[PDB]
């Protein structure tokens, strides 16, 4: 499987993510400093905020109650395709998903 992280400046980071790994853990484990992941991935901090490409939004599992109430706290612009990437678990069905990383998490 493969995930592409598009930073705020347009820089691309194409990354091979193992099945069962969240988009946060992959980013944090692979030098993607623009994703913080302060709480370790339990929808408790909103420092893994990413914008999901509109092609994959309807494919990824939807957000639960905790993620939405936590998404209200994002410091960047909250968009309808904003997600907590620690709640996006990688499966082969999501191969090629692109996420836009905001200019800030803190």
């Amino acid at each position: 499987s493969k995930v592409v992280y598009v930073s705020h400046d347009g820089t691309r980071r194409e990354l091979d993510v193992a099945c069962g790994v969240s988009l946060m853990q992959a980013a944090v484990s692979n030098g993607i400093y623009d994703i913080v992941g302060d709480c370790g991935g339990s929808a408790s901090c909103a420092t893994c905020h990413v914008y999901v490409n509109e092609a994959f939004t309807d494919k990824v599992p939807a957000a639960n109650e905790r993620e939405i109430g936590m998404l209200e706290s994002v410091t960047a612009e909250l968009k309808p395709n904003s997600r907590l990437c620690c709640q996006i678990i990688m499966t082969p069905e999501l191969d090629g998903i692109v996420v836009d990383v905001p200019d800030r998490q803190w």
């Binding site: 030098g31 302060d38 709480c39 901090c45």
Partner: protein, 405 residues
């Protein structure tokens, strides 16, 4: 000393457990806590010890409680009996606005980007200390490596010069070790007065070391005060110190008795990151908790506001419902599940630095001292508490089996 049973605690939930002196401690502290997970023990028990408090024994309840901001506090009511372990360098009366700002500032100091950049120097530090012990054929790993290593790592982060090593080591030693005629406040104030001149200095002309970043931080739209800055530096130095020291000793104690696990990592060093996560599960060592902020029925048990509830981080990974054969150390374990750094919004902000210190330690030790064992006739003693630990780890090896790298 056993506290009276509150009127809402049914008798069948009462369990004999003293978190500072568990009965089976000689089998190992993790094993002593696992008696809470035997087949006939409820998932949520009450103990008369240490003033009376709940203990959740299963990872599922432990994870849910740390996430449930409605009925469980964010701060721990469990006061460590030692004065040094009870101090909060950032006050508990803080509000979520300030809590977030301090997590952000600490993340600038020990976050994953910082750990990556400093890894090569952390590597050089581990090598230098291990090579210094390699030809001796003997050492107390706790005193001779486990304690100096993270202190020296703080000095790298904080841009402190090497001639301050004996003084800063002595000062952290007065704070962590209750032995010695000096109160914690006097040792803590002595630590502060070492930091204040460097803080005030690097506030004018800063750099990019840890002290400079903290000294130049902003809180509530205004510069961080000198009081806030010294507390941050003190927290970053002594916050992680005890758990890192003790966990390394837990890990090295196991590897000293497990030649087959050592050879597995020597032959396939690419498995050390996975092995470190399996050691973090198996030798988890923190057991803290929260307090109820409102009455709540939790998994069929009536909890009352003000009840203390221990939510031991170490028990989640030892739960057989989470990891089959939980006492088995399997470096190829498929789905390693634990809450060793905690769970929820206050998960250890030093988790990335801590994992890198463990991975570099195992890598650099096994390369130079691939074979070692406990000193014969030695009695390894464990201690139990909020942070459990190893009293001492005397190791011996044959210097001719070692390889200078």
């Amino acid at each position: 000393n056993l506290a009276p049973l509150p009127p809402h605690v049914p008798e069948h939930l009462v369990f004999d457990f003293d978190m500072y002196n568990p009965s089976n401690l000689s089998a190992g502290v993790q094993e002593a806590w696992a008696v809470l997970q035997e087949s006939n023990v409820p998932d949520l028990v009450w103990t008369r010890s240490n003033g009376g408090h709940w203990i959740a024994t299963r990872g599922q309840l432990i994870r849910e409680a740390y996430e449930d901001y409605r009925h469980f506090s964010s701060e721990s009511p469990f006061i460590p009996r030692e004065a040094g372990e009870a101090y909060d360098f950032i006050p508990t009366s803080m509000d979520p606005p300030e809590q977030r700002q301090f997590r952000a500032l600490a993340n600038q100091v020990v976050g994953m980007p910082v750990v990556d950049k400093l890894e090569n120097r952390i590597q050089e530090l581990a090598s230098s200390l291990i090579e210094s012990l390699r030809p001796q054929g003997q050492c107390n790993f706790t005193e001779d490596y486990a304690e100096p290593f993270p202190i020296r790592i703080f000095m790298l982060l904080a841009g402190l010069p090497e001639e301050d090593i004996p003084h800063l080591k002595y000062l952290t030693d007065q704070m962590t070790r209750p032995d010695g005629s000096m109160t914690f406040a006097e040792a803590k104030e002595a630590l502060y007065d070492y930091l204040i001149p460097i803080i005030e200095q690097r506030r004018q002309k800063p750099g990019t070391d840890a002290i400079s970043i903290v000294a130049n931080g902003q809180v509530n739209g205004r510069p961080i005060t000198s009081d806030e800055a010294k507390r941050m530096c003190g927290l970053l130095l002594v916050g992680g110190l005890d758990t890192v020291v003790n966990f390394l000793s837990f890990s090295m104690e196991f590897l000293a008795k497990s030649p087959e696990h050592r050879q597995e990592l020597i032959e396939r060093p690419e498995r050390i990151p996975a092995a470190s996560e399996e050691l973090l599960r198996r030798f988890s060592l923190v057991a803290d908790g929260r307090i109820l902020t409102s009455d709540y029925e939790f998994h069929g048990v009536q909890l009352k506001k003000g009840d203390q509830i221990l939510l031991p981080q170490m028990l989640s990974g030892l739960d057989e419902r989470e990891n089959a054969a939980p006492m088995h150390v399997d470096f190829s374990r498929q789905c390693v599940s634990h809450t060793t750094f905690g769970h929820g919004s206050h998960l250890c902000l030093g988790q990335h630095l801590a994992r890198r210190e463990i991975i570099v330690t195992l890598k650099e030790w096994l390369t130079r001292i691939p074979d070692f064992s406990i000193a014969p006739g030695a009695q390894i003693q464990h201690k139990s508490g909020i942070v459990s630990g190893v009293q001492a780890l005397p190791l011996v090896w044959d210097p001719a089996t070692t390889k200078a790298v």
